Amino acid sequence: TSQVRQNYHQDSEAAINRQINLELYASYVYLSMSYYFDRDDVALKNFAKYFLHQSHEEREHAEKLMKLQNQRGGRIFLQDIQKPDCDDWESGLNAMECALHLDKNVNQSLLELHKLATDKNDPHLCDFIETHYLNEQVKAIKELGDHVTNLRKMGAPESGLAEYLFDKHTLG
Amino acid sequence: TSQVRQNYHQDSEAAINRQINLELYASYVYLSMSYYFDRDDVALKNFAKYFLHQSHEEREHAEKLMKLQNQRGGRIFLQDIQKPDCDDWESGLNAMECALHLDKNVNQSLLELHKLATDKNDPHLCDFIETHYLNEQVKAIKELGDHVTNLRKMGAPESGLAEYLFDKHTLG
Amino acid sequence: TSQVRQNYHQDSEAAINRQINLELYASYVYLSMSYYFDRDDVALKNFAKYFLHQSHEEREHAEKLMKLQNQRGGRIFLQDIQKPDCDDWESGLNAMECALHLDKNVNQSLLELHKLATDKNDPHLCDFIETHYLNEQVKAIKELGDHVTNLRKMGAPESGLAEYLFDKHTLG
Amino acid sequence: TSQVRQNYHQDSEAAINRQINLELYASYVYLSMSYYFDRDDVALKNFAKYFLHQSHEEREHAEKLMKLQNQRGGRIFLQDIQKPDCDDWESGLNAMECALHLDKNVNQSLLELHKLATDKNDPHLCDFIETHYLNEQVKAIKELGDHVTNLRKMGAPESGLAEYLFDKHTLG
Amino acid sequence: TSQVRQNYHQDSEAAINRQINLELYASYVYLSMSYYFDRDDVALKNFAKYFLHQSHEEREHAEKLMKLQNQRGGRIFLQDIQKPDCDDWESGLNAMECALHLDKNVNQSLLELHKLATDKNDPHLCDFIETHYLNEQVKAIKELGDHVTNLRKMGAPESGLAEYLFDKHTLG
Amino acid sequence: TSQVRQNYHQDSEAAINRQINLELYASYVYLSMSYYFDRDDVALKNFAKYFLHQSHEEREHAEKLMKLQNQRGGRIFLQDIQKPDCDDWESGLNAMECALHLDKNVNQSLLELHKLATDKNDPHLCDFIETHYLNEQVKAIKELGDHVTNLRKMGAPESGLAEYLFDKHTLG
Ligand SMILES: [Ca+2]
Ligand SMILES: [Ca+2]
Ligand SMILES: [Ca+2]
Ligand SMILES: [Ca+2]
Ligand SMILES: [Ca+2]
Ligand SMILES: [Ca+2]
Ligand SMILES: [Ca+2]
Ligand SMILES: [Ca+2]
Ligand SMILES: [Zn+2]
Ligand SMILES: [Zn+2]
Ligand SMILES: [Zn+2]
Ligand SMILES: [Zn+2]
Ligand SMILES: [Zn+2]
Ligand SMILES: [Zn+2]
């Protein structure tokens, strides 16, 4: 038991360690999506940049949870980072749809972490999650939804014109 | 035999002289492609600029090989620069496809030059080719492939809209 | 088969994909080592910074190989990133010893990749590896060896004084 | 027939296409002369620079004629660029004598082009040639004559002292 | 056996130690040549400066090889630096001829070192030699050849006028 | 006999030539000591810098004596530079002790040179030696003595802590 540990439940500790793995996984999915758009037969450079940015943010989120763990006197236990579900992400629209899905899954896990912190009366953990994670996640999900909507309305994925112009005018 | 000549095989000398002619030819093809896009009935000003830039780079590559020849104590022997295969390059997509083809043919010749330098144990020539030519060539080929992919996906050559917007948003 | 692919052997492609996984793994090991030094019962802030820097460099190395793959017309296939061997890295000296070991293992893999590229007469891949990877790896290994030597001479891991002063005067 | 074509005779069009080839050839001769002076057994660096500058100007002149062709609604037809008459240009004086000769031959062709434009009552072509080509050509020829005179008076080609000092004091 | 040593053959180690001695010797020859030109009965101040610069570069090359040795885990073994063959270097032309000769001898040794590194499959050593040594050596040899050519053409060593003007206009 | 020679005894000339060799040797010893501290199993970077600085100063001292020789109308005769007595300098303290010893040996030779110049009534040589050499040598010896004292008092060579902290706080 850490000399700093206070009001920090075993279950919260375990849940943070799960959250660290999930942020790392999300980072990995976005890394895979970015370089898919860097292929010579896909060639949408701003989709690639957009997803590489999201990838580095997810890693940064992981790092902040790892800092949180040590702050509270918890002990970090890392797990394998699972390769993503796809190697080939099909189109800019499909990738955005999969990103939206992934962000909601990460959000659900954040919400469950907050429920747990509430159940354990850990107001420091509750506020940490609300301050750094919940509103950022909500903004991301709204942005990914906006992107999906625009791509669909432009006639993606069928219109390669649509994905080309979106890359230029929205992601550029 | 030059007072500077050292470890420089007759065959390498001949092969450099062939490479100088090929870079000059590539310069010429790109020159022809540029001014095709400057015609009043083609009128894609950024395709024209793009290909004029590639043309001057090829000439610069020729000049660097000519410098290399003299550096090593070889003797430059120039040959006719052959007019390109086409006068009319048809479309922005077709021109990019022909540029891709040409760059791979030049790359193949660079690779054969490197094999020869290796077979003759000429590490200075090997590194010259790797330093100035191989990665530049690989980048060019990846870029031309990206361009071809985007044009095709936008609906070129049939969509004159596609070639117009590509000229603006990618080459502009 | 990619429109850009040229002189790029199936085996090189596979070997790059293995190298991408290994750089990612090394990134992960360093991430784990960094936050070990951020524990309240370890508390060596510059060891933590040092290893976090190495972690981000490894990720950057992975990203550059992923770019290389697409450049050459290869296809990126990602694998799980394995959790590191330890959760608790014991001391600054032990962590540096494990870092040295890891960097030599990564170097060995780089060397095998270069042998393969040589055997396949792929001078572009040979030079890529020499330019970005081999000398950087040699510098890292020399630096980690210097660090290990100094820690040992100061009386680490037994002297907590030694690890404290090294963190201040060398890593600070 | 181009939508822009006006008062532009078939013969003028053909003559411009001949002029483009000749400027390109002159560029090539000067390129060859430059790198002759870059040989380790010739080694007059400012003769080399001087002739490389003239080479790039000739190419630029070719490009301006190609622009002219398209401006008027003509169609560019490129021909082989013939290798120059010599590989070895003998001395700085001899090269200047050959440059003088070449510039007068190019001038003669410019004058014949102007006669033709006059005979076809094409005042736009007449003025184009007078504005960009005739006075520039006359200056070049006067300069090359000045250079030849000075080299001869200094005792070139026999005095290697003379060619060395001219390179320093006039071309440097 | 060094904790950093990897893929570094005993023969490479020995060959680096030989190369360090040769760069040091070349430094010494150039030092001797410089101060010959500083004699009151020779008095060519820019020949003296030129050769002193080359001398310090050679020492710097030695130092970089010594760094390389330690980088790879090799052990530096220094040998006597032999006094140069001459005390009196006769003329600016003769000194340049001897410098050319010396640089080719050093180049030959560099090439043999590269053959050895290749035979031992040491791509790090191969690239080190190509990156820092081979092109620098080729440039030096081309420059020394240019200098020899110009001196000879001006009428050195017989013309003391020629050596005086070369010192001013080329080395100044 | 040089047109500039005046009041410059054959013995002084010979003694200067001996002094040039000794400064060069001292330069070499310091060069060897520097790179000993650059080994991965020694790793004291500021000891390495300190001794490399001393090395370049000794070379500069040699060069100034060579200038002196020519100034006075003497003739420089160079001898082999002998490899130093050790390859492995053992510790920072031992290296400083050997440096102190070497500097006193060089000082003794300077003093004998001054006695000779005095005996030959060569006030220009006497003052040259006093101005550039004697006080610089005395400062060096006092500094090396200070360093030795501090290392000994800190518990070097046995305390690797002592050598590490001295490198940081005194040589850094
Ligand atoms: Ca798995
Ligand atoms: Ca709150
Ligand atoms: Ca033909
Ligand atoms: Ca596992
Ligand atoms: Ca290389
Ligand atoms: Ca012909
Ligand atoms: Ca000897
Ligand atoms: Ca000896
Ligand atoms: Zn996140
Ligand atoms: Zn090229
Ligand atoms: Zn790496
Ligand atoms: Zn012209
Ligand atoms: Zn050298
Ligand atoms: Zn001294």
CA of F79 to the centre of ligand 7 (A): 7
Chains A and B: 3 or more CB pairs within 8 Å of each other: yes
DSSP states of A54-98: HHHHHHHHHHHHHHHHHHHT------PBPPPS-S---SHHHHHHH
Give DSSP secondary structure letters for D135-147.
Answer: HHHHHHHHHHHHH
Please report all neighbours of C, defined by 3+ CB atom pairs within 8 A: A, B, E, F
* Interchain touch B–E (≥3 Cβ pairs closer than 8 Å): yes
Name the residue of chain D whose CA is nearest to B43's CA. Answer: D70
Cβ neighbours of residue D70 under 8 Å, at least 6 residues apart?
Answer: B35, B38, B39, B40, D76
Give pairs for C110-119: CB < 8 Å, separation 24+. C110/C19, C110/C134, C110/C137, C111/E6, C111/E7, C111/E123, C112/C15, C113/C15, C113/C16, C113/C19, C114/E123, C115/E121, C116/C11, C116/C12, C116/C15, C117/C12, C118/E121, C118/E123
Residue E82: which region, alpha, beta or left (left: phi > 0; alpha: psi -120 to 50)? beta
Q: What residue type is assigned to position D101 of the chain?
A: H
State the distance from the centre of ligand 12 to the C-alpha of D12, rounded, in angstroms: 18
Nearest to B83 among D59, D79, D87 (CB): D79
Cis peptide before A157 (omega within 30 of 0): yes
The CA distances from residue A29 to A44, A138, A168, D71, in Å, are 17, 19, 23, 53
Reply yes or no: is the peptide bond before residue E123 cis, omega within 30 of 0.
Answer: no
Binding-site residues on chain B for chain A (CB distance < 8 A): 142, 145-147, 149-150, 152-155, 159, 161-162, 165-166, 169
Method: X-ray
Number of H helices, E strands in chain B: 6, 0
For residue D114, the one-letter residue type is H
In the structure encoding, which two tokens stand for residue F126, read together? 């006497």
Chains A and F touch (3+ CB pairs under 8 A): no
Q: Which helix (H) or strand (E) holds D23?
A: helix D10-37
d(CA D86, ligand 3 centre) in Å? 20
Q: How far is CA D27 from the centre of its chain?
A: 6
CATH number for D167: 1.20.1260.10
Closest CA to A60 of A139, A133, A123: A133
Instruction: Give the environment of ion ligand 10: residues with CB less than 5 A.
Output: B 23, 58, 61
- Whether residue E72 and residue C118 make contact (CB cut-off 8 A), yes or no, is no
Q: Which residue has the tokens 């009151």?
A: E40
> Closest Cα of chain C to F47: distance in Å?
13
Neighbours of F113 (CB within 10 A): 22
| Residue whose token pair is 């006067």 | D142
Start-end of H helices in E38-91: 45-72
CB contact under 8 A, E76 and F41: no
A162 Cβ contact list (under 8 Å, min separation 6): A151, A154, A155, A156
**Cβ <8 Å between E2 and C145:** yes
Q: Chain B residue with minimal CA distance to A168?
A: B169
- What CA–CA distance (Å, rounded) separates C101 from C104? 5
Rounded Cα distance between C59 and A52, Å, is: 12
Using a CB-CB distance cutoff of 8 angstroms, which residues of chain A are in contact with residue C87? Answer: 75-78
Task: Answer whether C145 sits within 8 Å of E71, measured CB to CB.
Answer: no
Cα separations in angstroms, D57 against A90, D27, D60: 50, 7, 5
Token pair for A61: 């989120």
Least Cα separation, residue C96 to chain E (angstroms): 12
Distance CA A88, CA A96 (A): 13
CA distance B36 to E12: 56
Task: Give the 3-state secondary structure of residue D172.
Answer: coil
E runs forming strands in E11-123: none
E116 token code pair: 């050895």
Helix, strand, or coil here: E31? helix
The structure tokens listed for C2 are 């990619």
Q: For chain B, what is the domain count? A: 1
CA–CA separation, C148 vs B158, rounded Å?
65
Q: Which chains touch D (3 or more CB pairs under 8 A)?
A: B, E
Q: What whole-number distance in Å separates Cα of residue C111 and Cα of residue C100?
A: 16
Query: Which token pair is A6?
Result: 């206070």
C&E contacts, CB < 8 Å: 42
* Token pair of D45 as six digits: 């660096």
Nearest bound ligand to the CA of residue D79: 3
For residue D38, the chain E residue with the least C-alpha distance is: E146
Write E22-27 long-range contacts (CB < 8 A, 24+).
E22/E106, E22/E109, E23/E58, E23/E59, E23/E61, E23/E62, E23/E65, E23/E106, E24/E58, E24/E59, E24/E62, E24/E81, E25/E81, E25/E82, E25/E84, E26/E58, E26/E102, E26/E103, E26/E106, E27/E55, E27/E56, E27/E58, E27/E59, E27/E62
Is E5 exposed, middle or buried, given 0-12, 13-18 or 19+ CB atoms closer than 10 A? middle
Q: Which residue of F has its CA nearest to C163?
A: F161
Question: Rounded to an integer, what is the distance from CA D59 to the centroid of its chain?
Answer: 9
Report residue B42: phi and psi, to 5°.
Answer: -125, -60
Interchain contact, E40 vs F2, CB within 8 Å: yes
* Composition of chain F by helix, strand, coil, percent to 5: 75, 0, 25
Residue in chain A lying closest to B142 (CA)? A40
8 Å CB contact of E80 and F81: yes
Which chain F residues are within 8 Å of E48, Cβ to Cβ? none
Whole-number Å distance, alpha carbon A74 to ligand 4 midpoint, is 22
Chains that touch F (3 or more CB pairs under 8 A): C, E
Distance CA F106, CA F127 (A): 18
- Say whether C40 and A67 touch across the interface (CB within 8 A): no
Domain assignment of residue C156, given as a range: 1-172
Asked whether D and C share 3 or more beta-carbon pairs under 8 angstroms, the answer is: no
Q: Chains with ≥3 Cβ pairs under 8 A against E? A: B, C, D, F
Centre of ligand 12 to C-alpha D133, Å, is 7
DSSP B4: T
For chain D, the maximum distance between any two Cα atoms, rounded to a whole number of angstroms, is 60
DSSP class of residue B88 equals -
